[PDB]
Amino acid sequence: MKDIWHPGERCLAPSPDNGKLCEASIKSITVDENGKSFAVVLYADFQERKIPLKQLQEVK
């Protein structure tokens, strides 16, 4: 809850290949009526995943 995420920012997100962390970029951030926040994350081969915002991690 301490991280502050902006669209366009580099992040670490669960890879679609193996689930391990890999570098990616935030395409958009959405908050919904339940209050849950998620990012649309874009990976290096242009795959897209819907990731809960709390699952992202800052790049090392």
Q: Which helix (H) or strand (E) holds 17?
A: none
Return all residues near 7 (Cβ < 8 A) that are at least 6 apart. 26, 27, 28, 29, 39
Tokens of 20: 């391990």
Asked if 52 contacts 38 with a C-beta cutoff of 8 angstroms, the reply is yes
Q: Measure the CA–CA gap between 7 and 5, rounded to whole angstroms.
A: 7
The distance from CA 9 to its chain's CA centroid, rounded to whole angstroms, is: 9
Asked if 10 contacts 21 with a C-beta cutoff of 8 angstroms, the reply is no
**Number of Cβ atoms within 10 Å of the Cβ of 26:** 20
Asked if 26 contacts 11 with a C-beta cutoff of 8 angstroms, the reply is yes
Bridge-based pairing state of the strands 21-31 and 10-14: antiparallel
